[PDB]
Structure 1
Amino acid sequence: ITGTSTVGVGRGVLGDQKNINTTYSTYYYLQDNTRGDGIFTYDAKYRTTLPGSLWADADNQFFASYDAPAVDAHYYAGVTYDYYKNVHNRLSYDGNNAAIRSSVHYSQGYNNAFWNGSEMVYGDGDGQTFIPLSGGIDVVAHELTHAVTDYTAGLIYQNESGAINEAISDIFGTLVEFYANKNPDWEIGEDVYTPGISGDSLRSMSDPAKYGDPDHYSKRYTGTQDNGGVHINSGIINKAAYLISQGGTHYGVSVVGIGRDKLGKIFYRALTQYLTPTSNFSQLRAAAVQSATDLYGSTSQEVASVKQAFDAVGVK
């Protein structure tokens, strides 16, 4: 929509108040003109046709409960954009400031969110398993990272390359959560998962097994469910990423942590320079080692830690 840039105010899924960038032209739209070619948030109106209608509001105030998921999808997409630009010098998911589009209120009681190849889509959850998915900053960043992966490595969504695709989104979803410093942790989806149960989450990067996911290559899922276990085997890579950053002793292998920032630098470089559509775990290890080498030299502690972490999870 062509109009005047302004700032509205609303309340997100968790009841928090935040300012959002909108555009005025008769109505106030969830169109952020301050980031690249824009961030656009749509109303899917409980249907499955996408993208739906660009979110229109009469007074630039978004405090209705129906508004909450829109406020968060719009706001968190902005934070994620800032992270990539500020931290990795990447302009939007395609690196050329492509417009970011998200649709909320997708279907009825839909317990998931996804990147459909063109935009992000968020369900409202059934109120038991999930509340509106856009309320979790790690969820939004995870989805947008799927876009980044699509335009870079292009990791195929099945088997090992798919598990890497998933891990990359969890890793960067987590790094964005720390970047926004929103009660950061190494868990995935804790803010929108099971409103009636405290302390749980969808996945854990620090301890994948906590939720039944493998934390070692010898325990990888070899079946066909979940596209060959893309959301299951990602636990092995998530654990490796956690070790590289924080350090620790896993299955008797000791890893000196090098911190979150370097973890982000190493994985972003691996993703954008070395990974290919069919890369497997072993190739990921090689890509990560090469990235750390480029960045810190072959005799660096950073290189040593990446090696130890992959050794720890049994990926040679």
Structure 2
Amino acid sequence: ITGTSTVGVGRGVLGDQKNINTTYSTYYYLQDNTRGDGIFTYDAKYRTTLPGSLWADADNQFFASYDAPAVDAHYYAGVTYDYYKNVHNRLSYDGNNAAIRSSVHYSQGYNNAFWNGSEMVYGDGDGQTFIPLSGGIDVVAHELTHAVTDYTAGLIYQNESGAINEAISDIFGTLVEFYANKNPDWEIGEDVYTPGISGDSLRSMSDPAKYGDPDHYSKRYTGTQDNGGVHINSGIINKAAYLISQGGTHYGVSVVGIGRDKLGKIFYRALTQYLTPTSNFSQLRAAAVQSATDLYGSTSQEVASVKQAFDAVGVK
């Protein structure tokens, strides 16, 4: 829409109050003109037709419970755009400031959220397994990172390349969660998953086996479910990324951590310059080693730690 840029206030899924960038033109719209070609948030009104209607509000205050998932989708897409711009110098997901669109209230009781190739889509959850998925900043950044991947490496969504695709989304969703300093951790989706149970999450990067995902290449899923285990076998790479950052000893192999910042620089470089659509885990290890070599030198501690981490999860 064409209008005047302004700032409104509302409450997110978790009850926290935040300011959001909106546009005024008769109604106040969830349209943020301050980032790239804009961030637009739509109401899918419990249907599956997309994108639905651009979110319009009469007084620029978003405190209704129906408003909450829109508030956070809009606000966390703005924080993810900021992270990629300020930390990695990338303007939006295509690198040329493409507009970011998200629809909330997709379908009824839908327990998922996803990047469909053109925009973000979020379910409200059934209220037991999940609450509205846009309340999780790691979920939002995980999904928006698939858009980055689609425009750069282009990893296909199956077998080892899909598991790399998923792990890259978990890694950067986690780094965004640390950049916003939103009670940060190495788990995924703990703010929106099972409201009635405290302490769990969908997946864990520090200990993937806690929820049953493999933490070593010899434990990888080899069947056909979940497009060859994209959400299961991503635990092997998540554990390697956690070790590179934080250090530790895993199956008797010791890794000195080099921190989150270098973790992000190495993986971002591997993703945008060396990964291809059909890269496998062994090619990710080579890409990460080469990236670390470009940035820190072939005899750095950083290169050494990337090697030990992949060795610890059995990836040669």
Deviation at 1:28, TM superposition (A): 0.2
CA drift of 1:282 comes to: 0.1
Partner deviation per Cα, 1:46-105 (whole Å, 9 max, x = no partner): 000000000000000000000000000000000000000000000000000000000000
Separation in 2, partners of 1:160, 1:133 = 26
| Alpha-carbon shift at residue 160 of structure 1 (Å) | 0.2
Query: Shift in Å at residue 239 of structure 1?
Result: 0.1
**Equivalent-residue separation in structure 1 for 2:167 and 2:273 (angstroms):** 17
Deviation string 1:238-297 (CA, Å, 9 cap, x unpaired) is 000000000000000000000000000000000000000000000000000000000000
SS at match of 1:221: coil
TM-superposed deviation, 1:200: 0.1
SS at match of 2:255: strand
CA distance in 2, matches of 1:103, 1:239: 32
After superposition, the C-alpha distances for 1:31-54 in whole angstroms (9 at most, x for unaligned) are 000000000000000000000000
2:269 pairs with 1:265: no
- Residue 139 (structure 1) shift: 0.3
Partner of 2:93: 93
Distance in 1 between residues matched to 2:225 and 2:66, nearest whole Å? 35
For residues 218 and 42 of structure 1, what CA distance do their matches in structure 2 show? 44
- CA offsets 1:82-140 (integer angstroms, 9 cap, x no match): 00000000000000000000000000000000000000000000000000000000000
Q: What stretches of structure 1 move > 3 A for 4+ residues in a row?
A: none
Corresponding residue number in structure 2 for 1:57: 57
Question: What is aligned with 1:2?
Answer: 2
The unaligned stretches of length 5 or more in structure 2 are: none
* CA drift at 1:306: 0.1
Distance in 1 between residues matched to 2:11 and 2:186, nearest whole Å:
25
Alpha-carbon separation, structure 1, partners of 2:23 and 2:311: 51
Q: Distance in 2 between matches of 1:189 and 1:92?
A: 23
Q: In 2, Cα distance between the equivalents of 1:173 and 1:224?
A: 26
Distance 1:229 1:125 in 2: 23
**Residue 289 of structure 1 pairs with residue 289 of structure 2:** yes
Q: Distance in 1 between matches of 2:106 and 2:282?
A: 37
Q: What is the rounded CA distance, in whole Å, between the counterparts of 2:10 and 2:224 in structure 1?
A: 43
Question: How large is the Cα RMSD of the aligned pairs?
Answer: 0.2
The whole-number CA distance in structure 2 between the counterparts of 1:313 and 1:2 is 52
- Following superposition, the deviation at residue 161 of structure 1 comes to 0.1
How far residue 208 of structure 1 moved from its aligned partner, in angstroms, is: 0.1
Q: What's the CA shift for 1:168?
A: 0.2
Please state how far the C-alpha of 1:312 moved relative to its aligned partner: 0.2
- Cα distance in structure 2, aligned partners of 1:112 and 1:227: 17
Deviation of 1:235 (Å)? 0.2
Q: What residue number does 1:155 align with? A: 155
- How far is the alpha carbon of 1:22 from its aligned partner? 0.1
What secondary structure, in the 3-state scheme, does the structure 2 residue paired with 1:95 have? coil
For structure 1, the 5+ residue unaligned runs are none
> Helix, strand or coil for the counterpart of 1:254?
strand
Match of 1:77 in 2: 77
Q: Distance in 2 between matches of 1:101 and 1:243?
A: 34
How far off its partner does 1:3 sit? 0.2
